[PDB]
Amino acid sequence: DISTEKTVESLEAIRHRIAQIVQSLTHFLAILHQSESLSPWPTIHKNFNILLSQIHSLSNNLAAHSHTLQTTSIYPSLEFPVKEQEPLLTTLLRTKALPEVEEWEANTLQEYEASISSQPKKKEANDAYQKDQLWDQARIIFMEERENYSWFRQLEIDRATEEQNANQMLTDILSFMKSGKR
Amino acid sequence: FFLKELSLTISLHPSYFGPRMQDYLKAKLLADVEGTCSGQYGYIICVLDSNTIDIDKGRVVPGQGFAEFEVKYRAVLWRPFRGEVVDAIVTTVNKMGFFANIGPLNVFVSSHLVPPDMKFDPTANPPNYSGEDQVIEKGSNVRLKIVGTRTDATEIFAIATMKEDYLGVL
Amino acid sequence: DLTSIQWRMPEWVQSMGGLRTENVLEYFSQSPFYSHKSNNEMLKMQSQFNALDLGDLNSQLKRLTGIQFVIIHERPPFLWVIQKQNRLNENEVKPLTVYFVCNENIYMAPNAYTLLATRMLNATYCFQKALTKIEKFPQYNPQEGYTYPKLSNDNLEENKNQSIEPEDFSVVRAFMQSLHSSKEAPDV
Amino acid sequence: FEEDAAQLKLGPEFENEDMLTVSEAKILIETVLAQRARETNGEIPMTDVMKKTVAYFNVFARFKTAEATYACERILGNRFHKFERAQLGTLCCEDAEEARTLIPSLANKIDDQNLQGILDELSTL
Amino acid sequence: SFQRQLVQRTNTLNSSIDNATLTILSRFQDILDIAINEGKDKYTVAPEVYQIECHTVSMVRAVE
Amino acid sequence: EQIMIAQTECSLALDMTSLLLSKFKENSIETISPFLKSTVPPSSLQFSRSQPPESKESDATLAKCWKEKSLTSSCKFLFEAKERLTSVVETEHEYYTELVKVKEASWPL
């Protein structure tokens, strides 16, 4: 019975993240619309950073949420208009991406298979688990060398102390130029 | 929140008669009333200056040299009353109650006025009052029903409860 | 394949004049979406045996185990909800896809995650594509800063503070402002 | 003397006055600020009362838009009880039974069906 | 004081160094975290490219 | 253009997901694009319980090859950026050598 709660809740978080990235990118495009000419490139990178925050939280919400989503299936209910409103919803039921880009994925399959034509029989994935696992260990060794390091004088503040009493010594001679007490 | 008409007297000084008094009177008004609070009208959020700003008078003082300019103005005020339901923003959570916060007024929800399903947890990462899945920490606007209000020194303070239906976590 | 694609043989509907009740599973039987070891089809085999013993549908169906295409939400005269399922008992049900009358088409209902992944992938693809045939044109310099080479720049054409001790409009802006004041200057 | 809750009861002047809306209130505040800025040196202390409101107002933007407010206004109409009005547009959700509980003063004031219809319009807004 | 001028100035310099250099550190660091493939959906593999992009570009950026 | 397509498609994500979550909470459908509420009533979309649904080798294969292409893209990035940066060094150095001719010859700066 919890799954409906998973729907309203986790999809509330999702639609929230969408509400972020979309309208925020409207703000983005508007920032682009500021352009009499040149775009602020570093700002653009900052925008892409914010996008990294978006993909961060979104990928975060993919999580075990997909474990529930895989069983899910969209369908319009009783209040959905029937006469000819459907086809746009069929597009909403249409999971199809960019046909050129799906063609691109097909290109990746067929051309990796072309690499297979260059390399007729060569398994790698089994030890590729140790490819990524060597990434997994070498990252740790990398962190080791990181932790080994020293990281970032204060004496400069004490240089002010040289002029501390020198100001007090400034008080000294003036007291002589004043009182002249010996 | 209300939009009402209030009065206030500005006692101007000769030094500022010039030829643009109107401006001075308006500037002085904003400064004296905005941010203030009374038990009678409550928090004077801000004054709807412009168009809704009347400047009558005034009659100079005999033994003072200062003239009193009566002013009628429209303002946004926030006055609370026992029995009103409002959304608040929890600020702190102590085994003493719930230190919420609505706008500019501070609302205290005595622990004794909180359901018996919300046990107090001080060990939990951040002191909170869960039950009962529902977890109310220092970041969860709750719904309360003002039970009693007080006005001590222009300032206002009342207590709210969570005993009725449809109150609590939002 | 199972999404927004044509699969129509309208003349069948032209004969039927449209759907009624069980006849939806007729044109659906014409559809690939129809299953052969569905209880609709194994008890279609029952129609090839017992024939008479099928009732409407759901009585003969759900009481018997296997794949089924039960009806629940009519939407006359176009849509009709018909979910796929798998009974494991005369009582138990294990529902599958909601096949639906898309009118001269019936489709499996897509995962939300599928289209969501489509959105994520296409969006991040727009990001990466923004990084593709665009990046590395503003070449960096500590001194010159980012640079924008051209056969001709036109079109148009953390440092230092203290230094030596247009307005393309010929103050035309204020002149236009004065035009605003002056168009009704006689009038105002 | 008068320290009840009601049930619509308390100060007469305040009762007479119309309770400003949340989103609309914030919009008006914004408008006011814009008019003031029209010729400012820079700064204008917002004291402490401003900060709080600025937060609560944004944390309750039941109409983050200049038109949202107008839409809401259009949807409404019948006064009934300034308070109740602003209260209904400040809470939201959802069923009748719930409406009475929150605003017992509604007793035999309005029906139901209608209420439900209004809630649906708000949720979609 | 003339002291805090040059002192806070140079402190801004080293702080900026901390900024860009730590940027290079973490951005080069987490690409290694990005290396994971198995046990994750292919569509979840898609973001990782953009992740690596932002990390490396952030690196050369911080270098600049 | 591209951001228009993807981002507005995401707006459709927010809108239709709002159509789904409008079955219960009303503080969700509110964010839909203005044309939609004028048209289709909320709470229209509804989820169905169905299927694993399916899986294929293209999943793992693309999951590998795309990461390969990604890390290699990082390599090309680091190397060609190394080129442009080295060139920037080659350019920038002349300035401060001429500034050896300046400051190391004692001139105002």
From Swiss-Prot, chain A:
The keyword Nucleus applies. The keyword Nucleus applies. One of its GO terms (biological process) is positive regulation of transcription initiation by RNA polymerase II. Its main location: nucleus. GO terms for molecular function: RNA polymerase II cis-regulatory region sequence-specific DNA binding; transcription coactivator activity; transcription coregulator activity. It comes from the Eukaryota. It is found in: Nucleus. It holds the Pfam family Med8. InterPro entries: Mediatior_Med8_fun/met. Signal peptide: none annotated. Keywords: Activator, Nucleus, Transcription, Transcription regulation. Component of the Mediator complex, a coactivator involved in the regulated transcription of nearly all RNA polymerase II-dependent genes. Mediator functions as a bridge to convey information from gene-specific regulatory proteins to the basal RNA polymerase II transcription machinery. Mediator is recruited to promoters by direct interactions with regulatory proteins and serves as a scaffold for the assembly of a functional preinitiation complex with RNA polymerase II and the general transcription factors. Component of the Mediator complex. Belongs to the Mediator complex subunit 8 family. This is Mediator of RNA polymerase II transcription subunit 8. It comes from Schizosaccharomyces pombe (strain 972 / ATCC 24843).
Curated annotation (Swiss-Prot), chain D:
It is found in: Nucleus. The keyword Ribonucleoprotein does not apply. GO terms for cellular component: nucleus; RNA polymerase II, core complex; RNA polymerase II, holoenzyme. It holds the Pfam family RNA_pol_Rpb4. GO terms for biological process: transcription by RNA polymerase II; transcription initiation at RNA polymerase II promoter. InterPro entries: HRDC-like_sf (IPR010997), RNA_pol_Rpb4/RPC9_core (IPR006590), Rpb4-like (IPR045222), Rpb4/RPC9 (IPR005574), Rpb4/RPC9_sf (IPR038324). One of its GO terms (molecular function) is translation initiation factor binding. Gene3D superfamilies: 1.20.1250.40. The keyword Kinase does not apply. Belongs to the eukaryotic RPB4 RNA polymerase subunit family. DNA-dependent RNA polymerase catalyzes the transcription of DNA into RNA using the four ribonucleoside triphosphates as substrates. Component of RNA polymerase II which synthesizes mRNA precursors and many functional non-coding RNAs. Pol II is the central component of the basal RNA polymerase II transcription machinery. It is composed of mobile elements that move relative to each other. RPB4 is part of a subcomplex with RPB7 that binds to a pocket formed by RPB1, RPB2 and RPB6 at the base of the clamp element. PANTHER family: DNA-DIRECTED RNA POLYMERASE II (PTHR21297). Component of the RNA polymerase II (Pol II) complex consisting of 12 subunits. RPB4 and RPB7 form a Pol II subcomplex. This is DNA-directed RNA polymerase II subunit rpb4.
Swiss-Prot record, chain E:
It comes from the Eukaryota. Transmembrane segments: none annotated. It is found in: Nucleus. Belongs to the Mediator complex subunit 22 family. Component of the Mediator complex. Component of the Mediator complex, a coactivator involved in the regulated transcription of nearly all RNA polymerase II-dependent genes. Mediator functions as a bridge to convey information from gene-specific regulatory proteins to the basal RNA polymerase II transcription machinery. Mediator is recruited to promoters by direct interactions with regulatory proteins and serves as a scaffold for the assembly of a functional preinitiation complex with RNA polymerase II and the general transcription factors. This is Mediator of RNA polymerase II transcription subunit 22. It comes from Schizosaccharomyces pombe (strain 972 / ATCC 24843). The chain holds residues 5 to 68 of 136 of the full protein.
UniProtKB/Swiss-Prot annotation, chain F:
Residues 39-59 are annotated as: Disordered. GO terms for cellular component: core mediator complex; mediator complex. GO terms for molecular function: transcription coactivator activity; transcription coregulator activity. Residues 40-53 have a biased composition (Polar residues). Keywords: Activator, Nucleus, Transcription, Transcription regulation. GO terms for biological process: positive regulation of transcription initiation by RNA polymerase II; regulation of transcription by RNA polymerase II; transcription initiation at RNA polymerase II promoter. It is found in: Nucleus. Belongs to the Mediator complex subunit 17 family. Component of the Mediator complex. Interacts with med18, prk1 and rbp1. Component of the Mediator complex, a coactivator involved in the regulated transcription of nearly all RNA polymerase II-dependent genes. Mediator functions as a bridge to convey information from gene-specific regulatory proteins to the basal RNA polymerase II transcription machinery. Mediator is recruited to promoters by direct interactions with regulatory proteins and serves as a scaffold for the assembly of a functional preinitiation complex with RNA polymerase II and the general transcription factors. This is Mediator of RNA polymerase II transcription subunit 17. It comes from Schizosaccharomyces pombe (strain 972 / ATCC 24843) (Fission yeast). The gene is med17. The chain holds residues 110 to 218 of 545 of the full protein.
